[PDB]
Amino acid sequence: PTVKPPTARKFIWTNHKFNLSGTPQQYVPYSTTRKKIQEWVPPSTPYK
């Protein structure tokens, strides 16, 4: 890389991180979508 440097992009990481498995920085999967069906919210109004 000294002779042939890699192209510079602003989004590229500056600080390389090693395998973080088994540490408090490990990757935990999760769903990245929002709730599908919205539930009807009962009125706070009490009238009967």
CA gap 20, 27 in Å, rounded: 8
Q: Is 3 in the site for another protein (CB under 8 A)?
A: no
For residue 8, the SS3 value is coil
What does the block give as tokens for 14?
A: 């500056």
Single out the residue of 2, 25, 30, 47 in contact with another protein (rule: CB under 8 A): 30
Single out the residue of 32, 38, 44, 45 in contact with another protein (rule: CB under 8 A): 32
Q: Is 2 in the site for another protein (CB under 8 A)?
A: no
Q: Is 38 in the site for another protein (CB under 8 A)?
A: no
CA gap 21, 29 in Å, rounded: 13
